[PDB]
Design an enzyme around this catalytic site. Structure first.
Site, short mmCIF file in Angstrom:
data_model
loop_
_atom_site.label_atom_id
_atom_site.label_comp_id
_atom_site.label_asym_id
_atom_site.label_seq_id
_atom_site.Cartn_x
_atom_site.Cartn_y
_atom_site.Cartn_z
N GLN A 1 72.50 25.63 -40.28
CA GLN A 1 71.56 26.71 -40.53
C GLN A 1 70.55 26.31 -41.60
OE1 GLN A 1 71.68 31.07 -39.64
NE2 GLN A 1 70.30 29.41 -39.04
N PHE A 2 69.40 25.79 -41.17
CA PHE A 2 68.39 25.36 -42.14
C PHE A 2 67.60 26.51 -42.76
CE2 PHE A 2 64.23 24.06 -39.72
CZ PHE A 2 64.21 25.29 -39.05
N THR A 3 67.75 27.71 -42.20
CA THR A 3 67.07 28.91 -42.71
C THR A 3 67.54 29.31 -44.12
OG1 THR A 3 68.56 30.48 -41.58
CG2 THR A 3 66.60 29.76 -40.36
N1 LIG Z 1 68.70 20.50 -43.19
C1 LIG Z 1 69.40 21.14 -42.25
N2 LIG Z 1 70.52 21.84 -42.56
C2 LIG Z 1 71.21 22.46 -41.62
N3 LIG Z 1 70.83 22.43 -40.34
C3 LIG Z 1 69.72 21.76 -39.96
C4 LIG Z 1 68.99 21.09 -40.93
N4 LIG Z 1 67.96 20.52 -40.32
C5 LIG Z 1 68.04 20.80 -39.02
N5 LIG Z 1 69.11 21.56 -38.79
C6 LIG Z 1 69.52 22.06 -37.43
O1 LIG Z 1 68.36 22.01 -36.54
C7 LIG Z 1 67.88 23.38 -36.33
C8 LIG Z 1 66.42 23.50 -36.76
O2 LIG Z 1 65.69 22.36 -36.30
C9 LIG Z 1 68.76 24.29 -37.20
N6 LIG Z 1 68.99 25.57 -36.52
C10 LIG Z 1 68.89 26.75 -37.13
O3 LIG Z 1 68.62 26.90 -38.33
C11 LIG Z 1 69.13 27.96 -36.20
N7 LIG Z 1 69.40 27.55 -34.80
C12 LIG Z 1 67.93 28.93 -36.25
C13 LIG Z 1 66.69 28.46 -35.48
C14 LIG Z 1 66.53 28.81 -34.13
C15 LIG Z 1 65.39 28.38 -33.44
C16 LIG Z 1 64.41 27.63 -34.11
O4 LIG Z 1 63.30 27.22 -33.43
C17 LIG Z 1 64.56 27.30 -35.45
C18 LIG Z 1 65.70 27.72 -36.14
C19 LIG Z 1 70.06 23.50 -37.32
O5 LIG Z 1 70.86 23.63 -36.13
#
Ligand SMILES: Nc1ncnc2c1ncn2[C@@H]1O[C@H](CO)[C@@H](NC(=O)[C@H](N)Cc2ccc(O)cc2)[C@H]1O
Ligand SMILES: Nc1ncnc2c1ncn2[C@@H]1O[C@H](CO)[C@@H](NC(=O)[C@H](N)Cc2ccc(O)cc2)[C@H]1O
Lengths: 163, 151
Positions: B79-81
């Site tokens: 969860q990068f959010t």
């Molecule tokens: N730095 C990171 N930390 C944790 N997860 C990460 C990180 N960088 C990438 N990710 C993964 O790639 C996705 C965003 O490119 C991240 N996904 C999410 O945050 C959720 N599916 C929410 C989401 C859903 C759709 C979207 O277009 C963007 C975000 C995670 O699976």
């Protein structure tokens, strides 16, 4: 003040009854939302109204939904979506001391309840009273949620340079 | 590193072409964000906390039992959010988040360590970089937040 905000397609909240006998159903559904946000809200012992106002403004303004092509375009109000606000003292669970969380930073329950109720009322004033749903402060709750994304946002107002 | 831990009765994670890929019963869902400057030591702290924080009760004591004690499961969701930059805008900007390609390799290490510290069977994960639908029963609810840069 601390909040975890999650984007949802829906949520059903039930609460443990006060009056419980043997061989009985113990939880009762009190709140339901469709698309929108669930906000787990923790009130800090030193929180002021300014902390609350920041959280409310942020929750209502976060652009967490796409439009037609545009990414992160619409906030909860833009789409006439709902908010489920749930009191959560566990956000002050200090986990640095070992394996047993302690929650001493959480605002004392009587003042926290009053604060919580003021916050709900302010959410309703700033947005729409029909769109704000709540749990039951001080009670065990069950929440069936459909997380959409997922999208999880954390805000601590003490990380912010508020006046 | 940032984590949101929620205590659950169950969780069902599905992805597009919806299709269920992971499910757990009682345990934890852990929404995990990797910072651009995170180290292995940051990861180890988060893994330790997820596995050992006593978020359940014993018959006579509150906050006495952890996920491993009860032989419960964990669902780890990238969860990068959690690095949304909400301090600086109302549209999430993920500039503090570790670059996704490098984050994926780091995440692979994290999941392996979860499986090493606990067991393979009890760790389920989402689909990195993909849209996910997660049906969850929050129990309490009990929500824990940890930022390793704050300790
Ligand atoms: N730095 C990171 N930390 C944790 N997860 C990460 C990180 N960088 C990438 N990710 C993964 O790639 C996705 C965003 O490119 C991240 N996904 C999410 O945050 C959720 N599916 C929410 C989401 C859903 C759709 C979207 O277009 C963007 C975000 C995670 O699976
Ligand atoms: N400072 C506070 N901020 C937010 N909510 C609070 C605060 N103080 C009390 N509450 C409410 O009272 C309950 C018990 O402390 C809080 N409840 C919870 O956090 C969830 N039911 C989780 C829980 C579960 C078990 C338990 O023993 C304590 C808490 C919250 O509704």
């Amino acid at each position: 003040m601390r909040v975890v905000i999650q984007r949802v397609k829906g949520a059903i909240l039930s609460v443990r009854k006060e009056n419980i006998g043997e061989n009985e159903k113990e939880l009762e559904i009190i709140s339901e939302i469709k698309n929108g946000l669930i906000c787990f809200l923790g009130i800090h012992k030193n929180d002021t109204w300014e902390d609350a106002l920041y959280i409310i403004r942020k929750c209502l303004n976060l652009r967490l939904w796409n439009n037609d092509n545009k990414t992160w375009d619409k906030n909860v109000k833009d789409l006439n979506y709902e908010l489920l606000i749930v009191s959560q003292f566990t956000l002050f669970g200090n986990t640095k001391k070992g394996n047993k969380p302690d929650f001493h930073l959480a605002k004392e329950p009587n003042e926290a309840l009053i604060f919580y109720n003021k916050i709900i009322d302010e959410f309703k004033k700033q947005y729409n009273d029909d769109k704000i749903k709540i749990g039951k402060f001080g009670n065990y709750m069950n929440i069936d949620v459909t997380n959409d994304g997922p999208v999880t946002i954390y805000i601590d107002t003490h990380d912010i340079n508020l006046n």
